[PDB]
Write a protein that holds these residues in place. Structure first.
Motif, PDB file in Angstrom:
ATOM      1  N   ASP A  82      16.820   7.257  -0.365  1.00  0.00           N
ATOM      2  CA  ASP A  82      16.352   5.752  -0.872  1.00  0.00           C
ATOM      3  C   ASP A  82      14.850   5.441  -1.187  1.00  0.00           C
ATOM      4  N   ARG A  83      13.829   5.946  -0.125  1.00  0.00           N
ATOM      5  CA  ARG A  83      12.871   5.740  -0.268  1.00  0.00           C
ATOM      6  C   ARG A  83      12.047   6.896   0.593  1.00  0.00           C
ATOM      7  N   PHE A  84      10.589   6.982   0.499  1.00  0.00           N
ATOM      8  CA  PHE A  84       9.957   7.927   1.544  1.00  0.00           C
ATOM      9  C   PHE A  84       8.429   7.369   1.246  1.00  0.00           C
ATOM     10  N   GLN A  85       7.696   7.694   2.095  1.00  0.00           N
ATOM     11  CA  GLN A  85       6.244   7.149   2.095  1.00  0.00           C
ATOM     12  C   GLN A  85       5.106   8.309   2.501  1.00  0.00           C
ATOM     13  N   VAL A  86       4.037   8.228   1.861  1.00  0.00           N
ATOM     14  CA  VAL A  86       2.784   8.826   2.166  1.00  0.00           C
ATOM     15  C   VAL A  86       1.795   7.607   2.657  1.00  0.00           C
ATOM     16  N   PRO A 117       0.855  -0.625  19.183  1.00  0.00           N
ATOM     17  CA  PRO A 117       1.081  -1.222  17.981  1.00  0.00           C
ATOM     18  C   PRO A 117       0.978  -0.499  16.884  1.00  0.00           C
ATOM     19  N   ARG A 118       1.296  -0.464  15.610  1.00  0.00           N
ATOM     20  CA  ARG A 118       1.231   0.484  14.468  1.00  0.00           C
ATOM     21  C   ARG A 118      -0.043   0.333  14.010  1.00  0.00           C
ATOM     22  N   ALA A 119      -0.597   1.956  13.653  1.00  0.00           N
ATOM     23  CA  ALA A 119      -1.923   2.020  13.042  1.00  0.00           C
ATOM     24  C   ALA A 119      -1.899   1.633  11.833  1.00  0.00           C
ATOM     25  N   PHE A 155      -3.552   3.191   2.839  1.00  0.00           N
ATOM     26  CA  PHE A 155      -2.752   3.420   1.550  1.00  0.00           C
ATOM     27  C   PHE A 155      -1.458   3.806   1.823  1.00  0.00           C
ATOM     28  N   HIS A 156      -0.541   2.797   1.612  1.00  0.00           N
ATOM     29  CA  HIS A 156       1.050   3.240   1.696  1.00  0.00           C
ATOM     30  C   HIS A 156       1.254   3.409   0.181  1.00  0.00           C
ATOM     31  N   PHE A 157       1.557   4.681  -0.157  1.00  0.00           N
ATOM     32  CA  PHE A 157       2.363   5.226  -1.231  1.00  0.00           C
ATOM     33  C   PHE A 157       3.955   5.443  -1.012  1.00  0.00           C
ATOM     34  N   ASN A 158       4.736   4.557  -1.260  1.00  0.00           N
ATOM     35  CA  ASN A 158       6.248   4.499  -1.095  1.00  0.00           C
ATOM     36  C   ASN A 158       7.152   4.349  -2.416  1.00  0.00           C
ATOM     37  N   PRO A 159       7.362   5.525  -2.851  1.00  0.00           N
ATOM     38  CA  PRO A 159       8.472   5.801  -3.861  1.00  0.00           C
ATOM     39  C   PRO A 159       9.704   5.254  -3.501  1.00  0.00           C
ATOM     40  N   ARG A 160      10.414   4.367  -4.134  1.00  0.00           N
ATOM     41  CA  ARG A 160      11.779   3.770  -4.084  1.00  0.00           C
ATOM     42  C   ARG A 160      12.533   4.058  -5.260  1.00  0.00           C
ATOM     43  N   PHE A 161      13.875   4.383  -4.740  1.00  0.00           N
ATOM     44  CA  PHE A 161      14.930   4.935  -5.849  1.00  0.00           C
ATOM     45  C   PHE A 161      16.077   4.270  -6.206  1.00  0.00           C
ATOM     46  N   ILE A 177       7.494   2.515  -7.591  1.00  0.00           N
ATOM     47  CA  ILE A 177       6.458   3.020  -6.338  1.00  0.00           C
ATOM     48  C   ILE A 177       5.810   1.605  -5.777  1.00  0.00           C
ATOM     49  N   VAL A 178       6.111   1.336  -4.602  1.00  0.00           N
ATOM     50  CA  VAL A 178       5.272   0.116  -4.062  1.00  0.00           C
ATOM     51  C   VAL A 178       4.171   0.727  -3.285  1.00  0.00           C
ATOM     52  N   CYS A 179       2.770   0.232  -3.602  1.00  0.00           N
ATOM     53  CA  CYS A 179       1.604   0.458  -2.748  1.00  0.00           C
ATOM     54  C   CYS A 179       1.249  -0.576  -2.066  1.00  0.00           C
ATOM     55  N   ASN A 180       0.626  -0.436  -0.879  1.00  0.00           N
ATOM     56  CA  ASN A 180       0.286  -1.937  -0.074  1.00  0.00           C
ATOM     57  C   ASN A 180      -0.802  -1.119   1.089  1.00  0.00           C
ATOM     58  N   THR A 181      -1.160  -2.193   2.208  1.00  0.00           N
ATOM     59  CA  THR A 181      -2.212  -1.915   3.062  1.00  0.00           C
ATOM     60  C   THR A 181      -1.567  -2.642   4.187  1.00  0.00           C
ATOM     61  N   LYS A 193      -0.159  -6.312   9.566  1.00  0.00           N
ATOM     62  CA  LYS A 193       0.568  -7.302   8.369  1.00  0.00           C
ATOM     63  C   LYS A 193       0.185  -6.573   7.176  1.00  0.00           C
ATOM     64  N   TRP A 194       1.252  -6.501   6.236  1.00  0.00           N
ATOM     65  CA  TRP A 194       1.314  -5.922   4.830  1.00  0.00           C
ATOM     66  C   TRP A 194       0.516  -6.972   4.038  1.00  0.00           C
ATOM     67  N   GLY A 195      -0.238  -6.548   3.183  1.00  0.00           N
ATOM     68  CA  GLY A 195      -1.009  -7.450   2.131  1.00  0.00           C
ATOM     69  C   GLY A 195      -0.131  -7.507   0.751  1.00  0.00           C
ATOM     70  N   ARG A 196      -0.588  -8.059  -0.408  1.00  0.00           N
ATOM     71  CA  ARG A 196      -0.008  -8.116  -1.596  1.00  0.00           C
ATOM     72  C   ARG A 196       0.311  -6.727  -1.949  1.00  0.00           C
ATOM     73  N   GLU A 197       1.874  -6.674  -2.444  1.00  0.00           N
ATOM     74  CA  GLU A 197       2.367  -5.093  -2.971  1.00  0.00           C
ATOM     75  C   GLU A 197       1.986  -5.064  -4.321  1.00  0.00           C
ATOM     76  N   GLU A 198       1.569  -3.694  -4.534  1.00  0.00           N
ATOM     77  CA  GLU A 198       1.214  -3.481  -6.029  1.00  0.00           C
ATOM     78  C   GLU A 198       2.413  -2.512  -6.450  1.00  0.00           C
ATOM     79  N   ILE A 226       3.563  11.414   6.692  1.00  0.00           N
ATOM     80  CA  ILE A 226       5.039  11.306   5.794  1.00  0.00           C
ATOM     81  C   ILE A 226       6.253  11.072   6.557  1.00  0.00           C
ATOM     82  N   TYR A 227       6.775   9.923   6.102  1.00  0.00           N
ATOM     83  CA  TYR A 227       8.084   9.358   6.496  1.00  0.00           C
ATOM     84  C   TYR A 227       9.206   9.277   5.558  1.00  0.00           C
ATOM     85  N   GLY A 228      10.414   9.283   5.892  1.00  0.00           N
ATOM     86  CA  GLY A 228      11.583   8.859   5.023  1.00  0.00           C
ATOM     87  C   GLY A 228      12.495  10.025   4.716  1.00  0.00           C
ATOM     88  N   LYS A 229      12.974   9.873   3.520  1.00  0.00           N
ATOM     89  CA  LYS A 229      13.992  10.993   2.887  1.00  0.00           C
ATOM     90  C   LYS A 229      13.446  11.888   1.860  1.00  0.00           C
TER      91      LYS A 229
HETATM   92  O1  5KM Z   1      12.739   5.859   5.401  1.00  0.00           O
HETATM   93  C1  5KM Z   1      12.610   6.036   6.547  1.00  0.00           C
HETATM   94  O2  5KM Z   1      13.174   6.553   7.454  1.00  0.00           O
HETATM   95  C2  5KM Z   1      11.250   5.286   7.031  1.00  0.00           C
HETATM   96  C3  5KM Z   1      10.448   5.628   8.107  1.00  0.00           C
HETATM   97  C4  5KM Z   1       9.381   4.919   8.475  1.00  0.00           C
HETATM   98  C5  5KM Z   1       9.171   3.655   7.888  1.00  0.00           C
HETATM   99  C6  5KM Z   1       8.239   2.849   8.482  1.00  0.00           C
HETATM  100  C7  5KM Z   1       8.054   1.365   7.627  1.00  0.00           C
HETATM  101  C8  5KM Z   1       9.189   1.174   6.743  1.00  0.00           C
HETATM  102  C9  5KM Z   1       9.098  -0.414   6.280  1.00  0.00           C
HETATM  103  O3  5KM Z   1       8.292   0.003   5.101  1.00  0.00           O
HETATM  104  C10 5KM Z   1       7.647  -1.491   4.481  1.00  0.00           C
HETATM  105  C11 5KM Z   1       8.815  -2.454   4.097  1.00  0.00           C
HETATM  106  C12 5KM Z   1       8.635  -3.142   3.239  1.00  0.00           C
HETATM  107  O4  5KM Z   1       7.454  -3.191   2.308  1.00  0.00           O
HETATM  108  C13 5KM Z   1       6.413  -2.431   2.756  1.00  0.00           C
HETATM  109  C14 5KM Z   1       5.404  -2.282   1.474  1.00  0.00           C
HETATM  110  O5  5KM Z   1       4.714  -3.591   1.357  1.00  0.00           O
HETATM  111  C15 5KM Z   1       6.722  -1.185   3.202  1.00  0.00           C
HETATM  112  O6  5KM Z   1       7.482  -0.378   2.168  1.00  0.00           O
HETATM  113  N1  5KM Z   1      10.015   1.874   6.213  1.00  0.00           N
HETATM  114  C16 5KM Z   1      10.058   3.346   6.800  1.00  0.00           C
HETATM  115  C17 5KM Z   1      11.184   4.118   6.459  1.00  0.00           C
END
Ligand code: 5KM
Ligand code: CL
Length: 150
Positions: free
Chosen positions: A38-42, A52-54, A58-64, A70-74, A79-84, A134-137
């Motif tokens: 469904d998604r993964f991130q670098v 607390p979370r580091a 640069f969040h590079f987050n492909p969504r499927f 691809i969502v990029c954010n900081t 707190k997340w900023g404005r999604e690109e 690197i997190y997710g599928k």
């Molecule tokens: O897929 C996984 O197993 C996995 C692992 C670690 C994660 C850590 C955080 C998030 C949430 O991500 C945020 C949710 C919403 O918007 C944000 C971007 O602005 C950003 O994408 N999802 C994760 C998902």
């Protein structure tokens, strides 16, 4: 000039970046999206704190879902900023990829499979990045750096 810090890392992977992300530095990630993804991130992080979370410079987050994106954010102080969002995505389920992140003075430039994909202006000074996550599928074959240092 490519020096891999890892092959076939278990996901999630969190690793220290061995040198400063100076202008001209490349980050090269080779991998494959599983069919059920469904998604993964670098995440280029200032540190590796989970709680607390580091900060994520640069969040590079492909969504499927649907036609993909691809969502990029900081993340600053959790707190997340404005999604690109880039609706033109070269990523697909069950497809391999080569991500190249180029660190410039004022932004990241990302190409995938040798084609421009997106820009992202620095919101945190890239000199403050010391960790890569690197997190997710996703399956990762390699992660490497081409540093300005050498
Ligand atoms: O897929 C996984 O197993 C996995 C692992 C670690 C994660 C850590 C955080 C998030 C949430 O991500 C945020 C949710 C919403 O918007 C944000 C971007 O602005 C950003 O994408 N999802 C994760 C998902
Ligand atoms: Cl620039």
């Amino acid at each position: 000039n490519l020096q891999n810090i890892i092959y076939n890392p278990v996901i999630p992977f969190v690793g220290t970046i061995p040198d400063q992300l100076d202008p001209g530095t490349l980050i090269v990630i080779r991998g494959h999206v599983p069919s059920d993804a469904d998604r993964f991130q670098v995440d280029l992080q200032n540190g590796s704190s989970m709680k607390p979370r580091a900060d994520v410079a640069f969040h590079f987050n492909p969504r499927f879902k649907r036609a993909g994106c691809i969502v990029c954010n900081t993340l600053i102080n959790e707190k997340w900023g404005r999604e690109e969002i880039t609706y033109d995505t070269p990523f697909k389920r069950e497809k391999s990829f080569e991500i190249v992140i180029m660190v410039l003075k004022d932004k990241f430039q990302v190409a995938v499979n040798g084609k421009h994909t997106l820009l992202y202006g620095h919101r945190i000074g890239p000199e403050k990045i010391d960790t890569l996550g690197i997190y997710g599928k996703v399956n990762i074959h390699s992660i490497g750096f081409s540093f300005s240092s050498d």
